[PDB]
């Protein structure tokens, strides 16, 4: 029943003050908290953090899942576009996974409150350039994740956090896997499957690669440009696979250029090898972002 020690990541439970809930899943819960001295350079200063933990009705397996997700975050390492792991409470008491606080919630919430007029944050209404910036940041985070030879398996707007300075943080590493020196992950158990974000090969063979993450990335792109819309509208999950094999793809969002849509459609290529790598996504999005940024002129006609 007990967890193995790891002194460098361990954090004292008195040093921590649990607070306002941020998210609740079935077996999981995320709460806001104050953790004093979690910065090693500022040993006396309190830091606002987020803490992932289980409900009391969580099973033994629910626990090993949370431990695995934590170890994934240790292995992945730090990047400006991946949510920061701060430390943990593993010893004598409930498992607390301590992580950087993102004050603007998840990308879906963030986008929805920043739509044009009909919660809302009107002064932060999204522009085309912002949308592209979002996408480029997430492309970079994924490019790093893939360079660590890991796969996410759950890219979605519900698992991206937005910080106070509008930085995209890839999060929820509960499906993530190490695929170093094997280059595919083959799921043998059934499970929680984010069906509307999965490549057809993953739906069918239960096998995951950097290529199926790229498929998920395209769905994420769609979520962004529909400003937090829900994929495959009016289509039930039991019908998606057949629909996908026979050629069905989501329509172009209006906020989306033809070029960005074609990028989108390319992530959804039926043949995994014909999809772009995250590296290629980064290069092309860098180009598009710069072009958009350099060509903005304010229009005072209205």
């Amino acid at each position: 029943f007990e967890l193995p020690e790891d002194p460098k990541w361990e954090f004292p439970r008195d040093k921590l003050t649990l607070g306002k809930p941020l998210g609740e899943g079935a077996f999981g819960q995320v709460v806001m908290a104050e953790a004093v001295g979690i910065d090693k350079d500022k040993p006396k200063e309190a830091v606002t953090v987020a803490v992932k933990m289980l409900k009391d009705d969580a099973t033994e397996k629910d626990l090993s899942d949370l431990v695995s997700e934590m170890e994934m975050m240790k292995m992945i390492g730090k990047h400006k576009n991946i949510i920061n792991l701060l430390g943990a409470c593993t010893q004598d008491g409930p498992l607390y996974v301590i992580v950087a606080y993102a004050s603007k919630g998840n990308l879906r919430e963030y986008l929805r409150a920043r739509r044009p007029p009909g919660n809302r944050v009107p002064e932060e209404q999204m522009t085309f350039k912002d949308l592209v910036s979002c996408t480029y940041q997430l492309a970079r985070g994924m490019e790093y994740l893939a360079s660590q030879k890991c796969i996410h398996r759950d890219l979605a707007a519900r698992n991206v956090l937005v910080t106070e300075n509008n930085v995209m943080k890839i999060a929820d590493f509960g499906l993530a896997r190490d695929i170093n020196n094997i280059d595919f992950f083959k799921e043998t158990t059934n499970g929680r499957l984010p069906v509307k974000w999965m490549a057809p090969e993953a739906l069918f063979d239960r096998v995951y690669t950097h290529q199926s993450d790229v498929w998920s990335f395209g769905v994420l792109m769609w979520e962004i440009f529909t400003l937090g819309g829900s994929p495959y509208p009016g289509i039930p999950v039991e019908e998606l696979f057949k629909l996908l094999k026979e050629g069905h793809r989501m329509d172009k969002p209006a906020n989306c250029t033809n070029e960005l849509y074609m990028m989108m459609r390319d992530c959804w290529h039926a043949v995994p090898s014909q999809r772009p790598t995250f590296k290629q996504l980064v290069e092309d999005l860098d180009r598009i972002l710069t072009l958009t940024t350099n060509e903005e002129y304010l229009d005072l006609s209205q």
Binding site: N294, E296, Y297, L298, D299, L300, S301
Partner: protein, 113 residues
């Protein structure tokens, strides 16, 4: 009409990136400059408003300069007008920017790196 060529805020030869480099050093709304563009008869006013840097096209045609729906005899008239009248969100033009103004109200450019 071409009296703008004398003013402190006018730049006959200055890129968009250079104007950004200058305006980034003056974090005040109302900081601005006018630059000639490469296209004939075009200018841009580059200014700061609500914390961010903006660029606007300004077209000349015959005896008139145009900015959005506003028309003026000259660039000097256009600038003089948007000092006493809001140009974008209650923001009036305030701090004319060139490299000598930046010596005085601008953040210092780091000599080392």
């Amino acid at each position: 009409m071409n009296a703008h060529e004398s003013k402190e805020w006018y730049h006959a030869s200055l890129t968009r990136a250079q104007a950004e480099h200058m305006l980034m050093r003056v974090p005040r709304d109302g900081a601005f400059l006018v630059r000639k563009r490469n296209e004939p008869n075009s200018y841009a006013i580059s200014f700061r408003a609500e914390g961010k840097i903006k660029h606007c096209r300004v077209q000349q045609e015959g005896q008139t300069v145009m900015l959005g729906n506003s028309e003026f005899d000259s660039l000097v008239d256009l600038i003089s007008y948007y000092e006493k009248h809001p140009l974008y969100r209650k923001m009036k033009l305030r701090y004319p920017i060139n490299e000598e103004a930046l010596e005085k109200i601008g953040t210092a450019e780091p000599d080392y790196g």
